[PDB]
Ligand binder design. Sequence first.
Ligand code: NA
Length: 421
Amino acid sequence: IINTSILNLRYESNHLIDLSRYASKINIGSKVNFDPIDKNQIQLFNLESSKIEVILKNAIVYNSMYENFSTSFWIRIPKYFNSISLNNEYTIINCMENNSGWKVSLNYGEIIWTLQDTQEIKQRVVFKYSQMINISDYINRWIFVTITNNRLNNSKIYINGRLIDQKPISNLGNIHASNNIMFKLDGCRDTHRYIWIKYFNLFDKELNEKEIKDLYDNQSNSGILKDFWGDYLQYDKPYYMLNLYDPNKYVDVNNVGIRGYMYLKGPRGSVMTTNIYLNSSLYRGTKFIIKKYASGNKDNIVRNNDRVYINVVVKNKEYRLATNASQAGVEKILSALEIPDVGNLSQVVVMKSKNDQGITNKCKMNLQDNNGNDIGFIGFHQFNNIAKLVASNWYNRQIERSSRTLGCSWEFIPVDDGWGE
Ligand code: NA
C-alpha cells in the first residue's frame, strides 16, 4: 500500500523527500525540528517558519466529485496545559483552497478531519480523547491516524487501526483541493503549542480495514521496544516504571541489598490544572536504567530479544536488579544489589515486546540465570499484603499454554516536555 501511495513523505539520505513516483517538491521552514534519534519524527512549533509545504504534481491535485482518497500519519500531541487551548480549533495539515478541499485540525482533546466542496457543503469527523483520566493512551503518546473517504458513502477516521467515527459525505459535490499541502499550526493561540508528526501518506483510494491494520503494524517498527510515549526505548536513559496491573502504584525499594526488596506502593497521587487536566502522577518511584549486556553494538536503541541488565536508582545512586533463584517458592523476590556484590545472582534480562488489543508500548522482562535458564518474567506478587517485585516462570508457562497473564507488563516513562509534570 505504501508503494502505491501518491505521496510518501519520508526522511532518508539526510533530507525530507517524497518517495512516491511523483516526487513532489518539499519546502521546509527553518524552525522545523527533526529528532536526531529518528529524523522521520518531525516537530512543528507555533511559529510562522516552522512549516512544511508539499508542492503537489498537477496530476494528483484533487478536483473531483467521485475519486476516493485516504491519508495516514502518526502524531504525538503534548498535553494541553492552559485554558487558552479551550475552544480553539487550529489547522495542522491544510489542503484547502477557497474553502474547498480537506484539512486536519486539532482542538482541546480532539483530532478533526474536515471536507468541504465548492458549494459551501461541509462534513467533519472527530476523534475525542479526555484529559480527566488516570492513565491516557493518547495524551502525549504516538497515535496512528488514518482517514478514508468514499465519495459515494462515508468518511471514516481510524485511531491505532480501529474505526472511531464515520459520517456520510455523499451530499458533497465537487471537491477542489489546494495545489499544496501545508503542515503548519494555523490559528493556534497557545504560543507554546507544538506537534510531533511522522510517516505521512496520501492514497488515491479508500483503504479497507485490513490495509489499515497492515499499515499500523508495518510502521510500528515492532522489532524495537518503545517507551511510554512511543519513542524508541534506549539504554543509559532513566525511566519511571509503570506496572499495568497496578497503574496506581509505583516502584520503590525497601532497603538496598539481598535483605531488602523492590515493591509497588501507592497511591501515585495526581497532577492537575483545574478544568484542563487531572491525571495520575507519572514521575514517581525509583527509576530504572537499562544497561547493555552485549557491548559490541554501538547503537543505543533497545531491540526485541536484547539481553540487558537493569540498574535501579536510589537516592542518586545506581544498584543492580537481581535475585537468588534458589529461594523457596515459584515467586523469586527481586532486590536492589550493590553492583560490586552481585556475585552469581541472576540479573540477566531478556527484553520483549507485548502487542495485544490494549495499551500500546508494553514491554516484558524475562530474567535468566548466568547459565541462560529462565527464571521468569518480571512482575509482582502479594507477600504480607505488599506487592513485591518478583520473577516467576509461572508467567511464562501461561503464555506458553495460551493462558492470559497480567502483572508482568511494564511501561518505561522518561521525562518529556509534552507532559509537564
Ligand atoms: Na552499571
